[PDB]
């Protein structure tokens, strides 16, 4: 698969894109004006998440649109991992909650059952690894083939 610094660069850009997508959902908790004064005088120990400059956000959104539109399940796992901030174990347990009994042919004589947490964690990890491997080269090419807009110039 990929190496580690490539994975670090891709995970940083995708975490920024996930926090940019998560800053646009409809349902959010409401805080009154007294809560805003308390947060402005003595804020929390942990601050918020960093966002994109909205052009990198739109470009990464178009890249994942071009790649992960044929697979709804992997794209939903990717959104719930990078935007909502949930860990892989939480996504695997939520997949174990709504799991349907599928015909397996690997262990035993092909019994029917509900799949456990271990195979759920394995398929979530495999989907995330394959999704990042499919996103990386076209995202590298899209960041390469983008014109760097410079500062304004003075003609006299």
């Amino acid at each position: 698969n990929l190496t580690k610094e490539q994975h670090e660069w891709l995970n940083g850009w995708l975490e920024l894109w996930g926090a940019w997508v998560y800053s646009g959902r409809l349902e959010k908790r409401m805080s009154s004006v007294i809560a805003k004064f308390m947060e402005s005088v003595e804020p929390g120990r942990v601050m918020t998440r960093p966002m994109c400059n909205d052009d990198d956000g739109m470009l990464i959104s178009q890249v994942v649109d071009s790649v992960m539109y044929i697979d709804k399940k992997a794209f939903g796992i990717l959104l719930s991992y990078y935007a909502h901030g949930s860990s892989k174990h939480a996504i695997a347990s939520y997949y174990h909650r709504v799991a349907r009994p599928r015909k397996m042919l690997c262990r035993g004589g092909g019994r029917i059952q509900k799949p456990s947490l271990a195979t759920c964690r394995r398929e979530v990890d495999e989907i995330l690894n394959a999704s990042l491997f499919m996103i990386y080269p076209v995202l590298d090419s899209a960041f390469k083939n983008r014109k760097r807009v410079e500062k304004i110039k003075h003609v006299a």
């Binding site: 960093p50 966002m51 304004i152």
Partner: protein, 100 residues
């Protein structure tokens, strides 16, 4: 902490800072549109005041960012047109910048 006017605006790109100078103020004559940043202003979200314990540990380690919340002056939507005058009044005691 005080709100600094500078071009070190986090989580924004060249499409908004192509008209600002190194001081955070739009050039006279730069035709702006709706949504473009005029004056680059950022409010501190952490802290600025320190103790002498934090002074010696600052000489050890360094600083942080502490400039998360951005409240820069942007053009209201629909308004356009070239900047014709920028007048920067300050207070007696605060050190000015290059644009001032």
């Amino acid at each position: 902490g005080p709100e600094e006017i500078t071009a070190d605006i986090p989580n924004v790109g060249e499409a908004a800072l192509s008209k600002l100078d190194e001081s955070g103020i739009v050039y006279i004559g730069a035709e702006v549109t709706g949504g473009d940043i005029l004056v680059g202003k950022v409010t501190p979200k952490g802290e600025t005041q320190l103790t002498p314990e934090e002074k010696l540990l600052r000489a050890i380690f360094g600083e942080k960012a502490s400039d998360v919340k951005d409240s820069s002056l942007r053009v209201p939507n629909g308004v356009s047109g070239t900047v014709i005058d920028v007048q920067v009044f300050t207070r007696d005691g605060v050190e000015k910048d290059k644009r001032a």
